[PDB]
């Protein structure tokens, strides 16, 4: 499914993302917008034979078990199938473990290039949360 901006904003707040590891809700909504265009089914196949899965394009080489990826680590202790759901629970859970590494939200290339430094608050304006 494709989330509305305010719809994803309210779900991420419910799922406790607001200032998790010090990162405001706007940061998380921006990350999803540029990573997946708010699409929970988005995938992307990478040179190294890994795949990025779901709303936050979480990579199979470290975070989740597909069954194809070389040097594959499954740090979130889940299959990547879960990261494709319209229920964001598993993506949020996995994103909290990712961001709780010293690299923070730098784990998200699309975040670093299009979100880091900008008026991320704009991403929750009108959502009254």
């Amino acid at each position, epitope marked *: 499914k494709v989330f509305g901006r305010c719809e994803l904003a309210a779900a991420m707040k419910r*799922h*406790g*993302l*607001d200032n998790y590891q010090g990162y405001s809700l706007g940061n998380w909504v921006c990350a999803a917008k540029f990573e997946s265009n708010f699409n929970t089914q988005a995938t992307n196949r990478n040179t190294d034979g890994s795949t990025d899965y779901g709303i936050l394009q979480i990579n199979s080489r470290w975070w989740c078990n597909d069954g194809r990826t070389p040097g594959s*680590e499954n740090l979130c*202790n889940i299959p990547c199938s879960a990261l494709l759901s319209s229920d964001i*629970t598993a993506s949020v859970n996995c994103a909290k473990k990712i961001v*709780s*590494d*010293g690299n923070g939200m730098n784990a998200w290339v699309a975040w670093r290039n299009r979100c880091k430094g900008t008026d991320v608050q704009a991403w929750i304006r009108g959502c009254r949360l």
Partner: antibody
Amino acid sequence: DVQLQESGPSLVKPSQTLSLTCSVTGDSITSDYWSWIRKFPGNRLEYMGYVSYSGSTYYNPSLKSRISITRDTSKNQYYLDLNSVTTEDTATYYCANWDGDYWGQGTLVTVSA
Amino acid sequence: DIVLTQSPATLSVTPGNSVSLSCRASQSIGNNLHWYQQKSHESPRLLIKYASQSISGIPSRFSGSGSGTDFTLSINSVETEDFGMYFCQQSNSWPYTFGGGTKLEIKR
């Protein structure tokens, strides 16, 4: 399945280093984030620290930078070193994964001359 | 750092009856509240993650709710083996902290 077991001395002299090993069986040190938690004799729990996949560590500021958490991928172990112990460091020590599904049996450490 | 306050310090309950355990956060922790069971100094065991999400192998009679600053672990139809310490733990902010624990006695 993943099993955790703490090992090392149960007796440490004051002002010296408390060194504990967590041995992991049934998956890789590279497969998770790895924590140390301790419990003081009066049912009080303290999150000490964890080491994440990149080597970045998080140390409780209560520990006044007396703490080192390191790994050895080849032995499938991670370590706790806690420097300059006093009797206030007498506690039961647990290794656990960041998710908190996997816990060691925990080991009692007494600080005493 | 975030202070977790558990109420009450103790409960005694008869098997088959229900209890409610309270955990209040010094500041908003969103949904970042996990519930553990421990008997004395044996290894803690995770009952609930993120306020309300189920853990495979934990019975349905354990239910977590709440958000922001106010949380609740509900234990329906208590069994003899539910004795021990119940701890809440926040992961909203490092350093992660634990409440002071609720002690559960079986009535017999």
